[PDB]
Amino acid sequence: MSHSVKIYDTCIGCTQCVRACPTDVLEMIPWGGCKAKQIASAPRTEDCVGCKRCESACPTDFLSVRVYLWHETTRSMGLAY
Amino acid sequence: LVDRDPIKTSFEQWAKPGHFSRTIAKGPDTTTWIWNLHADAHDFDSHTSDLEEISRKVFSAHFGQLSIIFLWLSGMYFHGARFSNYEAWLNDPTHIGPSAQVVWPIVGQEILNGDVGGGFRGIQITSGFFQIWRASGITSELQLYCTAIGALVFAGLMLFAGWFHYHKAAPKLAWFQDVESMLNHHLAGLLGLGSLSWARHQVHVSLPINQFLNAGVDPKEIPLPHEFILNRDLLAQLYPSFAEGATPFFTLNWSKYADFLTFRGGLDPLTGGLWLTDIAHHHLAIAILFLIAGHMYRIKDILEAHKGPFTGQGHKGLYEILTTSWHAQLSINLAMLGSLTIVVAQHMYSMPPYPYLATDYATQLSLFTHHMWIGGFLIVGAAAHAAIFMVRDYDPTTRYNDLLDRVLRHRDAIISHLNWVCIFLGFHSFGLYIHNDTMSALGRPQDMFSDTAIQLQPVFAQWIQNTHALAPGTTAPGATASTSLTWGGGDLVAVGNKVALLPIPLGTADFLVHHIHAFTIHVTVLILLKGVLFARSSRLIPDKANLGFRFPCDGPGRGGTCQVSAWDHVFLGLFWMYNSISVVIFHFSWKMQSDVWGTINDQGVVTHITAGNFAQSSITINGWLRDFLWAQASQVIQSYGSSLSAYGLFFLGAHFVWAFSLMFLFSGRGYWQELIESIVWAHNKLKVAPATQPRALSIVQGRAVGVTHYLLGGIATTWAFFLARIIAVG
Amino acid sequence: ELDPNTPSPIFAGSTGGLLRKAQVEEFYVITWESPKEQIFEMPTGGAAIMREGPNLLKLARKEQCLALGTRLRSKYKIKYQFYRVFPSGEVQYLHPKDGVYPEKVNPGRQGVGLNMRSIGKNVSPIEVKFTGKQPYDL
Amino acid sequence: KPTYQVIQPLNGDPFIGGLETPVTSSPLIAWYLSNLPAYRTAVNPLLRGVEVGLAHGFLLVGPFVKAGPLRNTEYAGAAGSLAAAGLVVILSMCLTMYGIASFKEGEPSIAPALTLTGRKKQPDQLQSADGWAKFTGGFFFGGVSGVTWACFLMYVLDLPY
Amino acid sequence: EAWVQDPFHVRPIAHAIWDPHFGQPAVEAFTRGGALGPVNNAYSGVYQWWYTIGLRTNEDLYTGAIFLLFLSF
Ligand code: CLA
Ligand code: CLA
Ligand SMILES: CC(=CC=C/C(C)=C/C=C/C=C(C)/C=C/C=C(C)/C=C/C1=C(C)CCCC1(C)C)/C=C/C1=C(C)CCCC1(C)C
């Protein structure tokens, strides 16, 4: 919000867990203690489109994201062209 | 998998949860995998990453079709035998109105069983045995009862060849992965040696045993079970024992003959099923070719050859992987097999090949729409399976820079055109009709599009029809009539019960249906074409060959990102074709009865099932339920308490089942979840649910239970609508 | 173009990539290394070869030009590299910045993950009525 | 000389589409189209206006005088103008309020020539509102007018056959 | 000042249908008895309640908008 879908979980470990999703998610930002110690929910999200490939894999244990962003550029949908 | 490879048990795998990708069906319980298992049961991305077997399965689990087609046919020959009406009907055609099936009078049943001919209670037929069966250079009920077990023979045996494969330790690669000869064989001697062999048992025996049937008798007052050997003495009436000729060639004299054949064209006055004196010659004249033809050839060579400038460099090399595909060499086939079935559906109705058809109206249109839905249900397929290629089949990318890599090169292109094609059509191809309404309901005919208001004038004629029925005066030899009696020029006299075929006139109300077909055939194909083409990669998703050719929809983003894929292009392309065929049917009978079917009496004042109501009145697309749907169908909704009744009595269900599809077609998915729990809750209180985690439908399963229903609904609806307006007047 | 012909990533034709909206707005382009002459797969449907230069193909939009990876790392190589071209220069230094390979640690940059309160009982709906004085612009 | 130009996808780089085949860029066609607003902007849009207005003008006659609503007219105000001196008018401001998707507000006058143009970045826009006026103004006097030497021309007609 | 002479089940009236697309069968019912140019008759009730609370005479009647509108502003 403008890209606000929560995939968070609690492990935020990313080995045999989740990577998939065009650019958007440059994480591994180890918070001072959470097991395989890499955490949060995103990096700078003003770049790419609206997947839920975002979970599909590696837990969000609650929801999982999808489209919810509304304010929606174009670069933010393939088609501005 | 696992227990217990490999050398160490016979002991078969009955017991231990799962199999089919690898954090498989998991210990942990669920339901989805029970539609999994049946769906995709046949598939190949699992079983093994290695060709080999698969062709070793498909050449077996193939087999069990033939065997089946073979258990089938038997119960039809048996059926078309001792549940008789065939004996009765043949001494007595023009008269009967055939049966093979009959109930047993349990519960309500019996109403379904209603006097059909040679004196008995039963349910009719629109499946023209009793008419291949004319054939029987012999006749006899118990006889078909041999042809019948002759059937179950081929089966058990042509079904133990399927034990005698996969399960037996199998052939391998070379065997098919040398293709070198295959069609060499197939077309030469079977394609040939059948049509050939069929010749020998198509004048030997059949011709004579209806040469002197087309008159009277009661069978066995004709055609013994052996009689037709060496005895080349009854073959005396139907030409010479060659008299002084020896193995054709020329040093032959005709001061008065020219062997059987003596080519016909037209229609027996007394049995207008087209002449048989021909039917040998044409099958003979086939086989030869095949006989000569199946003698290529060994492979590339011929395709590794003709290229050009813009043409197909990759033409040359058009697939090593056409010995290494299937999914490819199936999809090609379906387009042909399929597209080569509904070409039947014409040459049939405008050229009957069996004794007593046309007169028999309902027993060859059933046909022309059954054959019609395969020459379509097999074509969307013939696309699906190419999509299945286009996505996956080969190992890597070894196939390169060719005819395809070409076509794709353009792709936002071949489908860029085709599109506008359709909106050009549609506007010229349907709103065309809507004019009429809006202006005939406005009402000013001066200006409609009538076969008479917009300028066309009491003639259609001068085109090519009129240079077909009239061509027996070219290089043409001849033989009274044409080729297909439905052509412009000459002749009338066809049949002495009811009618058969005659000219079939055109202009507009023939002009524009013929065009709606265009636009209907075209936008069908758009969606399959662009569908299979954009199979694997795109500028809505490029990371888009990453699972399979199904996948639900990539995800809420990009705007939509739902339908995409190509399971689904082969989901909304069925959706059309159901129309493609469903309106082509709607076409034929409204013609074929508005004109043609109808009837002679004195001065042969013709009296169609309908005095051509078509005229000025299909052009209005209401006329299509004024004159069609509300007109005919009055036989469906009158049909209660009768004999056929099973149609009206279907026509409510299946005219229900369709109106149940929309629920499967039109709805969400975590919906019936959100619901399936409220349920799952009430379940747990009594202690009655959890085990086998009950789950809603697999996004695309959901679409699977659309579509399939929408068709078996929306279709048998007319299968009923029909048989109910040809049985009984017409 | 030609009088300056500086190419690298072989192709020939195609009605696929780049068209009007990559001048009038933004541009997007990927670059890479490689061993010896090898035939690839392609975004936009087509398919060609490699060898070198910069190995610098230009691409329509950036979801398009990382899929060289979603297969173009099932074909060897550490190094593949896409930036952002404008019609004039910079800000948005796309695969530039710091480190690379989304799954390491130098810094933390953005992200956060929480909103105000965390995933916990937001049976609590939407609170205040949106009013210019209480920290809900984040 | 070659196999077909020095063999090329586009002007040059093959990562733009266009797939320059024939029907695209054969000197056979690309010259049948550049006294007009194909490659280069001749004089201003001013004049091209009426060869465009007019040519497209005397069209739309037998379309709505031989396919007219109750057709083949015996009214001396048809076989020509009648109404359709409506289309050009319903669309001679179907245009003007598209040249409101052009503003860019100037007055240079460079329809006279200087140094062998280019108009350079001539692609994209680089035709302001005070241009798109003098064209869709050429349009009205090209539309209405181009409708009358249609009409005015008696009609000596070739027929069916 | 008809239908209040006695409202026998024959085709009241809403308003005058006027479309240039109409054929000359402007003359055919569609064009309905009493009135001249074609019309389409009250299937709304209004016609039995502008009447059913009295409100009658065709010189006595032609208010309607006049009030309601010197209201609806
Ligand atoms: C030569 C042809 C033929 C062959 C051998 C195959 C073979 C195959 N097809 Mg295929 N296909 C064909 C023609 C053929 N197809 C045609 C004509 C079409 C167009 C409709 C398709 C559309 C198609 C699709 C979309 C898919 C396949 C897939 C497949 C693969 C999956 C097989 C499977 O699990 O059975 C599937 C059958 C069932 C699970 C049985 C359910 C049948 C239901 C719908 C009943 C039909 C209605 C009927 C009236 C009900 C019986 C009566 C009832 C009222 C009592 C397999 C390799 C699938 C794949 O993923 O590739 C690997 C993919 O799903 N096919
Ligand atoms: C969505 C649509 C809608 C539409 C288009 C209509 C249309 C219609 N309804 Mg209706 N209706 C609707 C929703 C709608 N209704 C709903 C939701 C209800 C349930 C509440 C009703 C209940 C209803 C009833 C009971 C009746 C109608 C009737 C009618 C018809 C009469 C014409 C009319 O309404 O003038 C409307 C007239 C006015 C708005 C002005 C009168 C209002 C008076 C009461 C104002 C009093 C204020 C006054 C000045 C205060 C005085 C103070 C001081 C002087 C002391 C008309 C067909 C009538 C009918 O049967 O026709 C045959 C009648 O039977 N409707
Ligand atoms: C073995 C044989 C044979 C044969 C023959 C044959 C081998 C024949 C066959 C034929 C085939 C056919 C004739 C086919 C048929 C088909 C069908 C009939 C089908 C139909 C259909 C269709 C149309 C489609 C689908 C469906 C159905 C199936 C219905 C023989 C051999 C031999 C030898 C060596 C020795 C000497 C003698 C001889 C003789 C020389």
Ligand SMILES: CC(=CC=C/C(C)=C/C=C/C=C(C)\C=C\C=C(C)\C=C\C1=C(C)CCCC1(C)C)/C=C/C1=C(C)CCCC1(C)C
């Ligand atoms: C209600 C019901 C039913 C209904 C039903 C309906 C209401 C409908 C149905 C339908 C079905 C169907 C329909 C199926 C089928 C079929 C068929 C056999 C087909 C065939 C065909 C073909 C071949 C192809 C196409 C065409 C046709 C379709 C013809 C039932 C109910 C019930 C109950 C109470 C409870 C218990 C159970 C029961 C007893 C069950």
Ligand SMILES: CCCCCCCCCCCCO[C@H]1O[C@H](CO)[C@@H](O[C@H]2O[C@H](CO)[C@@H](O)[C@H](O)[C@H]2O)[C@H](O)[C@H]1O
């Ligand atoms: C249905 C709309 C009419 C438009 C098409 C009419 C043009 C041709 C005239 C009638 C066409 C039907 O053709 C029909 O003509 C005659 C009816 O008059 C019949 O005439 C038949 O009956 C008599 C018995 O010997 C004799 O006059 C003829 O020898 C014989 O051919 C024929 O059974 C048929 O050939």
Ligand SMILES: CC1=C(C/C=C(\C)CCC[C@H](C)CCC[C@@H](C)CCCC(C)C)C(=O)c2ccccc2C1=O
């Ligand atoms: C209605 C509907 C459902 C709900 C449909 C369901 C749950 C159908 C499945 C019901 C099963 C088939 C009942 C099976 C139970 C019996 C087999 C068990 C008893 C055994 C017999 C003896 C009765 C979806 O799940 C769905 C999913 C995606 C898109 C659209 C829809 C949709 O429209």
Ligand code: SF4
């Ligand atoms: S839950 Fe997802 S991405 Fe979140 S922390 Fe784990 S894998 Fe990382």
Ligand code: SF4
């Ligand atoms: S889930 Fe969202 S952020 Fe993540 S990749 Fe998909 S679109 Fe990007």
